[PDB]
Protein backbone atom coordinates (compact mmCIF):
# COMPACT_ATOMS: atom_id res chain seq x y z
CA UNK A 1 0.00 0.00 0.00
CA UNK A 2 0.92 3.54 -0.42
CA UNK A 3 0.79 4.25 3.43
CA UNK A 4 3.08 1.39 3.54
CA UNK A 5 5.53 2.62 1.68
CA UNK A 6 5.70 6.00 3.08
CA UNK A 7 5.61 4.41 6.33
CA UNK A 8 8.93 2.28 5.04
CA UNK A 9 10.62 5.39 3.90
CA UNK A 10 10.47 6.72 7.25
CA UNK A 11 11.17 3.71 8.93
CA UNK A 12 14.35 2.97 6.73
CA UNK A 13 15.63 6.61 7.67
CA UNK A 14 15.29 6.16 11.14
CA UNK A 15 17.49 2.81 11.09
CA UNK A 16 20.09 5.09 9.45
CA UNK A 17 19.51 7.61 12.28
CA UNK A 18 19.82 4.79 14.82
CA UNK A 19 23.29 3.71 13.80
CA UNK A 20 24.86 7.03 14.93
CA UNK A 21 27.58 7.51 12.29
CA UNK A 22 29.56 10.39 11.64
CA UNK A 23 27.27 11.72 8.98
CA UNK A 24 24.51 11.37 11.44
CA UNK A 25 25.97 12.81 14.49
CA UNK A 26 26.70 15.96 12.10
CA UNK A 27 23.01 15.89 10.57
CA UNK A 28 21.35 15.61 14.49
CA UNK A 29 23.10 19.29 15.59
CA UNK A 30 21.48 20.58 12.64
CA UNK A 31 18.04 21.25 11.65
CA UNK A 32 18.31 18.68 9.20
CA UNK A 33 16.83 14.94 10.14
CA UNK A 34 13.97 16.32 12.43
CA UNK A 35 12.84 18.03 9.42
CA UNK A 36 13.73 15.12 7.33
CA UNK A 37 11.43 12.87 9.36
CA UNK A 38 9.20 15.57 9.70
CA UNK A 39 8.56 15.60 5.97
CA UNK A 40 8.22 11.62 5.90
CA UNK A 41 5.84 11.40 8.89
CA UNK A 42 3.90 13.75 7.68
CA UNK A 43 3.43 12.02 4.25
CA UNK A 44 2.89 8.85 5.78
CA UNK A 45 -0.17 10.22 8.24
CA UNK A 46 -1.33 12.14 4.47
CA UNK A 47 -1.40 8.44 2.85
CA UNK A 48 -3.34 6.81 5.77
CA UNK A 49 -5.68 9.27 6.01
CA UNK A 50 -6.87 8.86 1.95
CA UNK A 51 -6.14 5.44 2.49
CA UNK A 52 -8.94 5.07 5.11
CA UNK A 53 -11.42 7.52 3.11
CA UNK A 54 -11.13 4.72 0.20
CA UNK A 55 -11.97 1.82 2.13
CA UNK A 56 -14.83 3.27 3.08
CA UNK A 57 -15.68 3.26 -0.23
CA UNK A 58 -16.15 -0.72 -0.45
CA UNK A 59 -17.71 -1.84 3.02
CA UNK A 60 -19.39 -4.73 3.98
CA UNK A 61 -22.62 -3.32 5.14
CA UNK A 62 -23.07 -3.87 8.83
CA UNK A 63 -24.42 -2.55 12.06
CA UNK A 64 -24.25 0.96 12.42
CA UNK A 65 -22.60 0.59 16.68
CA UNK A 66 -20.31 -1.93 15.04
CA UNK A 67 -19.06 0.43 12.19
CA UNK A 68 -19.17 3.35 14.18
CA UNK A 69 -16.44 1.54 17.20
CA UNK A 70 -14.57 -0.26 14.44
CA UNK A 71 -14.11 3.30 12.67
CA UNK A 72 -13.18 5.00 16.53
CA UNK A 73 -10.89 2.01 17.04
CA UNK A 74 -8.90 2.95 13.32
CA UNK A 75 -8.71 6.30 14.05
CA UNK A 76 -7.09 5.87 17.82
CA UNK A 77 -5.17 3.40 16.14
CA UNK A 78 -3.60 6.08 13.44
CA UNK A 79 -3.35 8.42 15.70
CA UNK A 80 -1.11 5.95 18.03
CA UNK A 81 1.30 5.68 14.81
CA UNK A 82 1.61 9.42 14.41
CA UNK A 83 2.41 10.11 17.98
CA UNK A 84 4.94 7.20 17.97
CA UNK A 85 6.68 9.16 14.83
CA UNK A 86 6.71 12.68 16.70
CA UNK A 87 7.78 10.80 20.23
CA UNK A 88 11.02 10.03 18.20
CA UNK A 89 11.58 13.29 17.07
CA UNK A 90 10.86 14.63 20.06
CA UNK A 91 13.66 12.17 21.43
CA UNK A 92 16.08 13.84 18.48
CA UNK A 93 15.34 17.65 19.38
CA UNK A 94 16.04 16.67 23.10
CA UNK A 95 19.44 15.42 21.68
CA UNK A 96 19.93 18.32 19.93
CA UNK A 97 19.76 20.44 23.18
CA UNK A 98 21.68 18.03 25.52
CA UNK A 99 24.50 18.25 23.11
CA UNK A 100 24.85 21.92 22.93
CA UNK A 101 24.76 22.24 26.75
CA UNK A 102 28.06 20.10 27.33
CA UNK A 103 29.20 23.38 25.60
CA UNK A 104 32.02 21.14 23.40
CA UNK A 105 32.51 18.27 25.81
CA UNK A 106 32.56 14.93 24.95
CA UNK A 107 29.11 13.45 23.49
CA UNK A 108 29.93 9.53 23.68
CA UNK A 109 27.59 8.83 26.46
CA UNK A 110 24.86 11.03 25.49
CA UNK A 111 24.60 8.97 22.15
CA UNK A 112 25.07 5.52 23.97
CA UNK A 113 21.59 6.59 25.95
CA UNK A 114 20.33 8.02 22.97
CA UNK A 115 21.12 4.86 20.99
CA UNK A 116 18.94 2.57 23.84
CA UNK A 117 16.02 5.28 23.81
CA UNK A 118 15.71 5.06 20.33
CA UNK A 119 15.48 1.17 20.07
CA UNK A 120 12.95 1.46 22.38
CA UNK A 121 10.71 4.21 20.64
CA UNK A 122 11.23 2.15 17.15
CA UNK A 123 10.03 -0.94 18.73
CA UNK A 124 6.85 0.86 19.84
CA UNK A 125 6.47 2.50 16.57
CA UNK A 126 6.74 -1.25 15.05
CA UNK A 127 4.39 -2.60 17.23
CA UNK A 128 1.75 -0.15 16.35
CA UNK A 129 2.09 -0.04 12.65
CA UNK A 130 1.42 -4.11 12.47
CA UNK A 131 -1.67 -3.24 14.65
CA UNK A 132 -3.13 -0.65 12.33
CA UNK A 133 -2.30 -2.95 9.69
CA UNK A 134 -4.31 -5.90 11.16
CA UNK A 135 -6.83 -3.43 11.91
CA UNK A 136 -6.78 -2.05 8.50
CA UNK A 137 -6.81 -5.78 7.22
CA UNK A 138 -10.62 -6.29 8.61
CA UNK A 139 -12.07 -2.68 8.48
CA UNK A 140 -13.61 -3.50 5.37
CA UNK A 141 -15.48 -6.93 7.02
C1 LIG B 1 10.36 -1.13 1.07
C2 LIG B 1 10.71 -0.15 2.22
C3 LIG B 1 10.45 1.29 1.78
O1 LIG B 1 12.13 -0.25 2.55
C4 LIG B 1 9.88 -0.43 3.47
C5 LIG B 1 8.47 -0.51 3.37
C6 LIG B 1 7.71 -0.75 4.53
C7 LIG B 1 8.34 -0.94 5.76
C8 LIG B 1 7.51 -1.14 6.94
C9 LIG B 1 7.90 -0.51 8.16
C10 LIG B 1 7.07 -0.65 9.29
CL1 LIG B 1 7.47 0.08 10.90
C11 LIG B 1 5.90 -1.35 9.22
C12 LIG B 1 5.52 -1.97 8.03
C13 LIG B 1 4.21 -2.63 8.04
C14 LIG B 1 4.69 -4.10 7.91
N1 LIG B 1 4.96 -4.78 8.94
N2 LIG B 1 4.82 -4.72 6.60
C15 LIG B 1 3.24 -2.89 9.12
C16 LIG B 1 2.30 -2.22 8.14
C17 LIG B 1 3.18 -2.67 6.99
C18 LIG B 1 6.32 -1.81 6.85
C19 LIG B 1 9.74 -0.84 5.86
C20 LIG B 1 10.50 -0.59 4.70
Do not use: I, N
Request: zero cysteines; proline letters at 1%; a neutral charge.
Amino acid sequence: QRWELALGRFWDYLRWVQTLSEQVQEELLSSQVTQELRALMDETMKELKAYKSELEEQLTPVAEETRARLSKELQAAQARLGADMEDVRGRLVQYRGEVQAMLGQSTEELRVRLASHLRKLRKRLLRDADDLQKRLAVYQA
